[PDB]
Design an enzyme around this catalytic site. Structure first.
Site, PDB file in Angstrom:
ATOM      1  N   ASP A  67     -10.856 -32.007 -17.424  1.00 30.24           N
ATOM      2  CA  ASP A  67     -11.208 -31.367 -16.156  1.00 30.24           C
ATOM      3  C   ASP A  67     -12.147 -30.194 -16.474  1.00 30.24           C
ATOM      4  O   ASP A  67     -11.690 -29.087 -16.714  1.00 30.24           O
ATOM      5  CB  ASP A  67      -9.937 -30.845 -15.467  1.00 30.24           C
ATOM      6  CG  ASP A  67     -10.224 -30.104 -14.162  1.00 30.24           C
ATOM      7  OD1 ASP A  67      -9.247 -29.671 -13.516  1.00 30.24           O
ATOM      8  OD2 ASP A  67     -11.410 -29.951 -13.779  1.00 30.24           O
ATOM      9  N   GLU A 123       0.698 -21.427 -26.441  1.00 30.12           N
ATOM     10  CA  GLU A 123       0.877 -22.876 -26.414  1.00 30.12           C
ATOM     11  C   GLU A 123       0.662 -23.485 -27.809  1.00 30.12           C
ATOM     12  O   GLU A 123       1.367 -24.413 -28.208  1.00 30.12           O
ATOM     13  CB  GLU A 123      -0.094 -23.502 -25.414  1.00 30.12           C
ATOM     14  CG  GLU A 123       0.233 -24.938 -25.011  1.00 30.12           C
ATOM     15  CD  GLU A 123      -1.015 -25.724 -24.625  1.00 30.12           C
ATOM     16  OE1 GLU A 123      -0.922 -26.626 -23.754  1.00 30.12           O
ATOM     17  OE2 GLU A 123      -2.093 -25.447 -25.206  1.00 30.12           O
ATOM     18  N   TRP A 160       3.543 -25.424 -18.371  1.00 29.59           N
ATOM     19  CA  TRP A 160       4.224 -26.672 -18.644  1.00 29.59           C
ATOM     20  C   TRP A 160       5.530 -26.834 -17.882  1.00 29.59           C
ATOM     21  O   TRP A 160       6.183 -27.865 -17.995  1.00 29.59           O
ATOM     22  CB  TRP A 160       4.513 -26.808 -20.141  1.00 29.59           C
ATOM     23  CG  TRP A 160       3.401 -27.403 -20.950  1.00 29.59           C
ATOM     24  CD1 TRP A 160       2.325 -26.752 -21.485  1.00 29.59           C
ATOM     25  CD2 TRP A 160       3.265 -28.778 -21.321  1.00 29.59           C
ATOM     26  NE1 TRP A 160       1.531 -27.641 -22.170  1.00 29.59           N
ATOM     27  CE2 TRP A 160       2.085 -28.891 -22.084  1.00 29.59           C
ATOM     28  CE3 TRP A 160       4.029 -29.929 -21.081  1.00 29.59           C
ATOM     29  CZ2 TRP A 160       1.650 -30.108 -22.610  1.00 29.59           C
ATOM     30  CZ3 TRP A 160       3.598 -31.141 -21.605  1.00 29.59           C
ATOM     31  CH2 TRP A 160       2.419 -31.220 -22.360  1.00 29.59           C
ATOM     32  N   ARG A 197      -9.414 -37.782 -24.342  1.00 27.43           N
ATOM     33  CA  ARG A 197      -9.571 -38.953 -23.486  1.00 27.43           C
ATOM     34  C   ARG A 197     -10.092 -38.627 -22.094  1.00 27.43           C
ATOM     35  O   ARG A 197     -10.898 -39.369 -21.545  1.00 27.43           O
ATOM     36  CB  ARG A 197      -8.256 -39.708 -23.368  1.00 27.43           C
ATOM     37  CG  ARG A 197      -7.204 -38.956 -22.621  1.00 27.43           C
ATOM     38  CD  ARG A 197      -5.926 -39.739 -22.648  1.00 27.43           C
ATOM     39  NE  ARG A 197      -4.880 -39.009 -21.972  1.00 27.43           N
ATOM     40  CZ  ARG A 197      -4.855 -38.804 -20.663  1.00 27.43           C
ATOM     41  NH1 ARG A 197      -5.818 -39.291 -19.891  1.00 27.43           N
ATOM     42  NH2 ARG A 197      -3.876 -38.087 -20.130  1.00 27.43           N
ATOM     43  N   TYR A 204       3.041 -33.532 -27.806  1.00 26.87           N
ATOM     44  CA  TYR A 204       2.266 -32.901 -28.888  1.00 26.87           C
ATOM     45  C   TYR A 204       3.059 -32.420 -30.094  1.00 26.87           C
ATOM     46  O   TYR A 204       3.108 -33.097 -31.120  1.00 26.87           O
ATOM     47  CB  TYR A 204       1.435 -31.746 -28.336  1.00 26.87           C
ATOM     48  CG  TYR A 204       0.308 -32.217 -27.459  1.00 26.87           C
ATOM     49  CD1 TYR A 204      -0.756 -32.942 -27.991  1.00 26.87           C
ATOM     50  CD2 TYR A 204       0.324 -31.977 -26.084  1.00 26.87           C
ATOM     51  CE1 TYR A 204      -1.779 -33.418 -27.175  1.00 26.87           C
ATOM     52  CE2 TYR A 204      -0.695 -32.449 -25.255  1.00 26.87           C
ATOM     53  CZ  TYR A 204      -1.747 -33.171 -25.814  1.00 26.87           C
ATOM     54  OH  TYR A 204      -2.770 -33.643 -25.025  1.00 26.87           O
ATOM     55  N   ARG A 254      -5.267 -40.692 -10.543  1.00 25.57           N
ATOM     56  CA  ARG A 254      -4.010 -41.289 -10.118  1.00 25.57           C
ATOM     57  C   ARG A 254      -3.746 -41.045  -8.634  1.00 25.57           C
ATOM     58  O   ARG A 254      -3.494 -41.984  -7.885  1.00 25.57           O
ATOM     59  CB  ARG A 254      -2.843 -40.742 -10.949  1.00 25.57           C
ATOM     60  CG  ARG A 254      -2.703 -41.368 -12.340  1.00 25.57           C
ATOM     61  CD  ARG A 254      -1.512 -40.799 -13.113  1.00 25.57           C
ATOM     62  NE  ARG A 254      -1.878 -39.703 -14.016  1.00 25.57           N
ATOM     63  CZ  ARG A 254      -2.269 -38.485 -13.637  1.00 25.57           C
ATOM     64  NH1 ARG A 254      -2.359 -38.179 -12.349  1.00 25.57           N
ATOM     65  NH2 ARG A 254      -2.555 -37.563 -14.552  1.00 25.57           N
ATOM     66  N   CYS A 296      -3.695 -35.465 -23.619  1.00 25.31           N
ATOM     67  CA  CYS A 296      -5.106 -35.508 -23.272  1.00 25.31           C
ATOM     68  C   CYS A 296      -5.916 -35.479 -24.547  1.00 25.31           C
ATOM     69  O   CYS A 296      -7.065 -35.921 -24.577  1.00 25.31           O
ATOM     70  CB  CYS A 296      -5.494 -34.323 -22.394  1.00 25.31           C
ATOM     71  SG  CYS A 296      -4.909 -34.490 -20.700  1.00 25.31           S
ATOM     72  N   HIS A 297      -5.300 -34.951 -25.601  1.00 24.96           N
ATOM     73  CA  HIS A 297      -5.943 -34.860 -26.901  1.00 24.96           C
ATOM     74  C   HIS A 297      -5.374 -35.949 -27.793  1.00 24.96           C
ATOM     75  O   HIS A 297      -4.360 -35.762 -28.468  1.00 24.96           O
ATOM     76  CB  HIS A 297      -5.695 -33.491 -27.526  1.00 24.96           C
ATOM     77  CG  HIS A 297      -5.723 -32.366 -26.541  1.00 24.96           C
ATOM     78  ND1 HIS A 297      -6.793 -32.132 -25.701  1.00 24.96           N
ATOM     79  CD2 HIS A 297      -4.808 -31.410 -26.259  1.00 24.96           C
ATOM     80  CE1 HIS A 297      -6.533 -31.079 -24.944  1.00 24.96           C
ATOM     81  NE2 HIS A 297      -5.335 -30.623 -25.264  1.00 24.96           N
TER      82      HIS A 297
HETATM   83  O1  UFP Z   1      -5.389 -29.019 -21.250  1.00 26.82           O
HETATM   84  C1  UFP Z   1      -5.398 -29.722 -20.261  1.00 26.82           C
HETATM   85  N1  UFP Z   1      -6.268 -30.778 -20.181  1.00 26.82           N
HETATM   86  C2  UFP Z   1      -6.317 -31.568 -19.067  1.00 26.82           C
HETATM   87  O2  UFP Z   1      -7.104 -32.489 -19.024  1.00 26.82           O
HETATM   88  N2  UFP Z   1      -5.394 -31.365 -18.040  1.00 26.82           N
HETATM   89  C3  UFP Z   1      -5.388 -32.200 -16.819  1.00 26.82           C
HETATM   90  C4  UFP Z   1      -6.655 -32.041 -15.946  1.00 26.82           C
HETATM   91  C5  UFP Z   1      -6.774 -33.419 -15.255  1.00 26.82           C
HETATM   92  O3  UFP Z   1      -6.641 -33.286 -13.835  1.00 26.82           O
HETATM   93  C6  UFP Z   1      -5.559 -34.185 -15.811  1.00 26.82           C
HETATM   94  C7  UFP Z   1      -5.850 -35.676 -15.922  1.00 26.82           C
HETATM   95  O4  UFP Z   1      -4.683 -36.328 -16.427  1.00 26.82           O
HETATM   96  P1  UFP Z   1      -4.947 -37.904 -16.542  1.00 26.82           P
HETATM   97  O5  UFP Z   1      -6.177 -38.163 -17.536  1.00 26.82           O
HETATM   98  O6  UFP Z   1      -3.628 -38.633 -17.103  1.00 26.82           O
HETATM   99  O7  UFP Z   1      -5.304 -38.500 -15.099  1.00 26.82           O
HETATM  100  O8  UFP Z   1      -5.359 -33.614 -17.119  1.00 26.82           O
HETATM  101  C8  UFP Z   1      -4.498 -30.294 -18.102  1.00 26.82           C
HETATM  102  C9  UFP Z   1      -4.450 -29.494 -19.208  1.00 26.82           C
HETATM  103  F1  UFP Z   1      -3.578 -28.467 -19.276  1.00 26.82           F
END
Ligand code: UFP
Ligand code: UFP
Lengths: 281, 281
Positions: free
Chosen positions: A193, A62, A84, A190, A110, A25, A170-171
């Site tokens: 990182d 969490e 968070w 989906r 979630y 983004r 993300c899950h």
């Molecule tokens: O458990 C987690 N998983 C994860 O993927 N992100 C962050 C890392 C990555 O920079 C961001 C991507 O968000 P998006 O796919 O909407 O661009 O999600 C943060 C967490 F706490």
């Protein structure tokens, strides 16, 4: 058998040798690969990465946080876990278009999705009893009565609620599997990182299997981590390069010091990690 | 350049070797493995399995059926494809408690979730224009406006609509990915019969990716197939072993005869499979 962490280091390896350049983004830039899958055994061990200390306290708190069905960053903040709070700030809320929303309120994220899927969301401080589909409990029920079931799924991806969220999940979803009285779980992520995120996720859901296994009288099986957009940020390149050389140390073990009957009775004191000797940070 | 069909033949092999026994809903035994993944290139070739003929007409007609957001089995049946008629029979419905539903009415299934996710399902004749979320369309819009986005998901799993469906969906969700003008898709199948189902499903979503790429002006990239419960009936272990020794033949090619701009404007006459020579059996 080879160490379980090699599966994870092997992916960092792959992303560096075959990862194409892609932006997020913001436009920070990363190396991405689409479509990965790792398997982590849960039999007498816990997939808590060793090449780098994982925020164990964060994972545990969490998860208990989601279990409750809470959508308030504050309830998780008042535990030492601030992961968070950034999304619950006063500005971030208005930034997306949620001024009427009280600070901390993350929206139908979630927790909400796991205990009240499909229930009209209102605010973080509200009652949702008997509202929406309680997936988590339904899963437990099924595992106990029909372990052969191939449709034991928890879905956190709710298209109609995506707007009202501080950040899409993300899950997207997780599926359970039982065979030979052994409980396995696969998670679909989906985006992940690899640097400072996936490791925390692996533990989150690895723990979730353990808990459920405990209340269902099954033995932890396998945890399958399936990724969509697995990426490494261009800056984490160097840091990870020295990490790929560090030798993984035996995974720790998770003991459940108490005996629980329901998924809700789990306390943070109920768990204990032994043999966790991470690499210096 | 290892032939694509080997990834698939490899999976069956893996199941025979490492899979365990697991009974299905009717009690029938299967050889099951939980957690699988294969990658299929969509570049200049279409992954329509050759070691055994795949019901192409069924694949094409059915997808066109989902794009229409249709939920009436008779609409698909009056096209030469009967794969859904069984769940629309007066008999099948009654047993499920849908004695008020008409013959052909499958409920809030794929089509419905894809174009009207969240909408209140009435019947197979109702109009849902503007109701629910049109994920198919949203996916397509996002590919164009924000190709680097990691939320390009289309979910068919609606916990809330489960009790109203003739049967739970197998294709939980699918994610799209765009990098270097290439369009990729990952599909998460909660369960699949490597013998009869999977081949059909692979083709179905490979086709979807071709379509969306065609409309968005991108080149088809890879198609990732993620599985939950990959099984094979025990009574098929023999004919399968015979098929496993078959040498995969070059994958056929798919061509869209006329240029189409909208996903709804696709018709069966627009596609053509050329060079498809499967193993006679
Ligand atoms: O458990 C987690 N998983 C994860 O993927 N992100 C962050 C890392 C990555 O920079 C961001 C991507 O968000 P998006 O796919 O909407 O661009 O999600 C943060 C967490 F706490
Ligand atoms: O496209 C399809 N894909 C598929 O996997 N099945 C079947 C194969 C398997 O035997 C069945 C399992 O359904 P369940 O998990 O509810 O037992 O799904 C049917 C289709 F039409």
């Amino acid at each position: 058998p080879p160490h379980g962490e090699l599966q994870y280091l092997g992916q960092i390896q792959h992303i560096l040798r075959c990862g194409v350049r892609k932006d997020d983004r913001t436009g920070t830039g990363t190396l991405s690969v689409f479509g990965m899958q790792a398997r982590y055994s849960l039999r007498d061990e816990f997939p808590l990465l060793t090449t780098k200390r994982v925020f164990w306290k964060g994972v545990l708190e969490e998860l208990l946080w989601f279990i409750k069905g809470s959508t308030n960053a504050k309830e998780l903040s008042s535990k030492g876990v601030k992961i968070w709070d950034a999304n619950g700030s006063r500005d971030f809320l208005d930034s997306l278009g949620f001024s009427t929303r009280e600070e901390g309120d993350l929206g139908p994220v979630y927790g909400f999705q796991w205990r009240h899927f499909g229930a009209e969301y209102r605010d973080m401080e509200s009652d949702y009893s008997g509202q929406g589909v309680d997936q988590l409990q339904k899963v437990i029920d099924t595992i106990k009565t029909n372990p052969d079931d191939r449709r034991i799924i928890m879905c956190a991806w709710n298209p109609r609620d995506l707007p009202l969220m501080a950040l899409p999940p993300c899950h997207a979803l997780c599926q359970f599997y039982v065979v030979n009285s052994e409980l396995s779980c696969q998670l679909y992520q989906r985006s992940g990182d690899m640097g400072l995120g996936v490791p925390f996720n692996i533990a989150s859901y690895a723990l979730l299997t353990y808990m459920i296994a405990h209340i269902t009288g099954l033995k932890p099986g396998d945890f399958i981590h399936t990724l969509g957009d697995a990426h490494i940020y261009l800056n984490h390149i160097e840091p990870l390069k020295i990490q790929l050389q560090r030798e993984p140390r035996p995974f720790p073990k998770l003991r459940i010091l108490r005996k629980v009957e329901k998924i809700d009775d789990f306390k943070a004191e109920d768990f204990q990690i032994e043999g966790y000797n991470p690499h210096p940070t």
